[PDB]
Amino acid sequence: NITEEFYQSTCSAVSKGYLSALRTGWYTSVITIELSNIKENKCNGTDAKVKLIKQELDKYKNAVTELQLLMQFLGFLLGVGSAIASGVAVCKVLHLEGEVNKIKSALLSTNKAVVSLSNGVSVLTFKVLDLKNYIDKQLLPILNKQSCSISNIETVIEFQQKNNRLLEITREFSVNAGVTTPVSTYMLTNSELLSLINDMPITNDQKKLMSNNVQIVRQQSYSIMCIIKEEVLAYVVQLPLYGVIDTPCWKLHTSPLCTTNTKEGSNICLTRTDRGWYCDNAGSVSFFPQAETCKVQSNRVFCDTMNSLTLPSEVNLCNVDIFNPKYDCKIMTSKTDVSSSVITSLGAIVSCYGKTKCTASNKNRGIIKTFSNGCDYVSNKGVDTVSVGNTLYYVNKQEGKSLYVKGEPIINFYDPLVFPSDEFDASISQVNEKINQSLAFIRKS
Amino acid sequence: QVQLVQSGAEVKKPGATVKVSCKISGHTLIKLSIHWVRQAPGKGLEWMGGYEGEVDEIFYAQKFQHRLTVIADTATDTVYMELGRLTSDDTAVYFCGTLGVTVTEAGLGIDDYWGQGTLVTVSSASTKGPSVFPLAPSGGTAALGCLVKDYFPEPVTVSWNSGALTSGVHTFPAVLQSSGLYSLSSVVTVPSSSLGTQTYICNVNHKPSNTKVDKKVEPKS
Amino acid sequence: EIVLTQSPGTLSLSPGERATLSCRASQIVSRNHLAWYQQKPGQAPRLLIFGASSRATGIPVRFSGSGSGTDFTLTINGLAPEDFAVYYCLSSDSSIFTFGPGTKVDFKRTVAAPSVFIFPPSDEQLKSGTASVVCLLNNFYPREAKVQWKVDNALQSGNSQESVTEQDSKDSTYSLSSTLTLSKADYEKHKVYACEVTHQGLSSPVTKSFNRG
Ligand SMILES: *[C@@H]1O[C@H](CO)[C@@H](O)[C@H](O)[C@H]1NC(C)=O
């Protein structure tokens, strides 16, 4: 159930029918891998199987040494936060003398425990791998002797299975300076991530959504290497909590809009600079100017408030009547009359200024409709490919209904006489005052 | 560089009690197995008891459990054996050795560290110099020798003609007589034709008693 | 209790030949808990093979272990000169250690019968009250030899002690001294003092005797 409208007046398109999945806050969890305080062993035999585990154990001993070494459009309007601050905060909580013992004592006999830290926060805690119970109990007392013998070849292979995950965890942390994203299946397997979500202090609708899009729960999560103390290796996974769900969203698409004069440099240009994602949130509209930070799965839209503006709900009025009394819609000015196509959810915006040859094609027979010079639009219904100049555009073959909103292009309402052509961030009531300053004042003189 | 150094040789009287040490250098006692193994003269190896450092338990064979104690001092890496009510059957060389084997599912390991041994001679005897009695010769090659009898303690050295005669000499190992004194023979085979010209003397030295005897061995018919 | 037996008593082989030493248990012993030790005269035991077939650190490849249940086998595939010593097997059940009798690896020589010599007691020793009769078995091979004393054709029992030399480093032979110890009374009350020697090298036994006069 997806719909889309295009405004012939403003060279812009709105795509309604998308559901919200906003990331309001973060949740922190503490992953642990119990380790093995082990030194240079004593057995120096030449048995083929022994030299295999002797070098495999050095992979464990050096992987620990490596982590130990670590611990010694309007994006200019957006704010600046520290995404991993919540996880780094929990990390420094784990430094305090006694905080690591609480985790091991609560993980002494179970592989999952709810620990209340010093600062009065309950964090889900996970013990993920038993290398200590295998190396200390079955492997170390043989190597730390003079001569040592390995029973089975299958023991070597079984060791490689156990040691592999720890090496691949170290591999990511060594290459990402202790902070990795998206959180790989090594830092958290689907079985572990889903058991986290089901036991997070969150809503049953909140778990329903996370479970269906774990591939997007991963891209919006961080894993932070924290401490390796005593015989414990703990790294914090910072999972998102979605506090605004199932509200209606809509995506605005904008392209340059110029006059249609034939002579060079005789054209004035205007472009709507409020494109991006919009979703209803507590009576206001959260505007994400960077649509790249939002991720679209089917009709669900996962965004991060860190890349949002909290705007009044009057911004929605900027679609029907652009001027209006309530909200002052934002626009940029220029004189660059260059053709460019923008692909929307159910179509593609066509701006064909100049000598550019712009057309819309079908896979049975291309170039079914031709565009005159100006900013026009055609639905994806029946159209497969679109060409503007030397750039061929493939239109989204997603189904849905289209609606063409007709109107006179707004650029014809402006006198190109003293039209300010270098207003990067301005607005309509600011453009009209930019008119009166060069209209009224020059008239009186 | 692990090294196990035992106490020195002991001489004890019947019914006494001997203490033998095993000091550990280059290693720790709490990770080691230390067992005592003795070897009577000319006989096989016999296990007595030991201590498993990993479990901190002391084991004894039932043959010696009533009169043997093993002690483990972890602070000085020293293990002792204490064996009382000694008899002549206890005269043996006592070794400390890492016999223990540790087994797990991945495999099994063992230590092989040994001391130098500690000799314990048990007889009711004092130091005594030997008497030297001749074994006088009577086809083409003739045999003669000396009988170094009734001395204590070991050992006794024998040469022939002050070391000049070496070919054909056979100095036997001493045996422990029922008297509590050792005794051995040394023999040499010579051409019978030389019995009339070359003089054969055996030079016996028993340093524990400062006894040296040169005994001339003449033919007897 | 566990009683371990080994066979043969003495194994006679030359360098380059294969040694095969057995160790057998009165009851089943754990394969992890059977070891093979080497001991040369004057030295402490040395571990060769532990855990039945596993080889100790720094033991040549020629040493191989095998066996299970009650029968075990140490196999030296090409004897080296330093390998001629005594080899003991060692079992353990619940930290209770037990050692085998011992198998001795001998230098194989052509069979050589013993030169037998018999020595009366010197008159100097008789004046002290004790008479030592010595019977010498000189430079022979193999070591298996039996000495019998006959005083006036009466079989002597309980009054003799044998001493064997180590296998001579040059000719690979043995020498043995049997010593008959009598009181001066008992040595004067009889006439014929005879030393009887049996050995594989002699088709029939050899007897050397003297009269007291
Ligand atoms: C050999 O063993 C010694 C101690 O027995 C140990 O310190 C050393 O690291 C070992 N060599 C190798 C290459 O592991």
Numbering used by the authors:
A (entry chain A): 27 to 98, 137 to 509
B (entry chain B): 1 to 52, 52A, 53 to 82, 82A, 82B, 82C, 83 to 100, 100A, ...
C (entry chain C): 1 to 27, 27A, 28 to 212
What do the study authors state?
To investigate the conformation of site Ø and define the epitope on prefusion RSV F recognized by AM22, we determined the crystal structure of the AM22 Fab alone and in complex with the prefusion-stabilized RSV F variant DS-Cav1. The crystal structure of the F–AM22 complex shows that three AM22 Fabs bind to prefusion RSV F at the membrane-distal apex of the trimer and have a vertical angle of approach, in agreement with previously published negative stain EM images. AM22 buries 729 Å2 of surface area on each protomer of prefusion RSV F, mediated primarily through interactions between the heavy chain and F1 subunit. The high affinity and specificity of AM22 for prefusion RSV F is due to the formation of a three-strand anti-parallel β-sheet between the CDR H3 of AM22 and α4–α5 loop of F1. When bound by AM22, the α4-helix kinks near residue Pro205 and shifts away from α5, stretching the α4–α5 loop and allowing it to adopt a β-strand conformation that pairs with the β-hairpin formed by the CDR H3 of AM22. Upon RSV F triggering and the rearrangement into the postfusion conformation, α4 and the α4–α5 loop refold into the continuous α5-helix, which would disrupt the β-sheet interaction and prevent AM22 binding. The Lys209 side chain of subtype A prefusion RSV F is coordinated by three residues of the AM22 heavy chain. This includes the formation of a salt bridge with Asp100G of the CDR H3 that effectively extends the prominent β-sheet interaction. The structure of DS-Cav1 in complex with AM22 shows a more open conformation of this site, with the α4-helix kinked out and away from α5, resulting in a stretched α4–α5 loop and a larger angle between the α4 and α5 helices. However, the structure reported here of DS-Cav1 in complex with the human antibody AM22 matches the unbound DS-Cav1 structure and demonstrates that this conformation is a naturally sampled alternative conformation of prefusion RSV F.
